[PDB]
RNA sequence: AAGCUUGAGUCUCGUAGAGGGGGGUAGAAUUCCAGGUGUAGCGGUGAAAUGCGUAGAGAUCUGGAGGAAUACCGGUGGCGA
């Protein structure tokens, strides 16, 4: 069995899109998602629910 | 035609500063190169499409390549016709 027990999360929110990453302080991203990638476009790309399901999916 | 030090000009030890060149010193990501991580949409708009996509477009790591450009400090602060 192999677990990390420690992590780092980074949220980058703009008026174009919201990006969510889960990564390691000595490694690379092990989860990545976007609010546009939740199935919301144009005026909806960066909305609270579009990002709420992106963080959940990640 | 001789003076004067009062305009003009000169020397010591010192002074601020984006003035003009050349050589040094560095990074960022869009890009480009290779091998990995790894995916269903990506981009844009009031709303879309041309375009680009599972043959991995989109996103990203690691060591290399390249072109424009120099945040901070910097102040109703300086240099000069």
Swiss-Prot record:
Q: Name one GO molecular function term.
A: small ribosomal subunit rRNA binding
The UniProt entry's GO biological process terms, in alphabetical order, are: cytoplasmic translation; translation
Q: What is this protein called?
A: Small ribosomal subunit protein uS11
Sorted keywords for this record are: Methylation, Ribonucleoprotein, Ribosomal protein, RNA-binding, rRNA-binding
Q: Is Transmembrane among this UniProt entry's keywords?
A: no
Function in brief: Located on the platform of the 30S subunit, it bridges several disparate RNA helices of the 16S rRNA. Forms part of the Shine-Dalgarno cleft in the 70S ribosome.
Please give the family membership noted in the entry.
Belongs to the universal ribosomal protein uS11 family.
Quaternary state and interactors: Part of the 30S ribosomal subunit. Interacts with proteins uS7 and bS18. Cross-links to IF-3. In stalled ribosomes contacts ribosome rescue factor SmrB.
Task: Indicate the span of the full protein covered.
Answer: 13 to 70 of 129
In its miscellaneous comment, the UniProt entry states: Has been predicted to contact the N-terminal domain of IF-3 based on footprint studies; exactly how IF-3 interacts with the 30S subunit is controversial.
Q: Which residues form the signal peptide?
A: none
Which cellular components does GO assign to this protein?
Answer: cytoplasm; cytosol; cytosolic small ribosomal subunit
């Amino acid at each position: 069995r192999k677990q990390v027990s420690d992590g780092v999360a980074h949220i980058h929110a703009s008026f174009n899109n919201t990006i969510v990453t889960i990564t390691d302080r000595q490694g690379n991203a092990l989860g990545w998602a976007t609010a546009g990638g939740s199935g919301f476009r144009g005026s909806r790309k960066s909305t609270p629910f579009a990002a709420q399901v992106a963080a959940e999916r990640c």
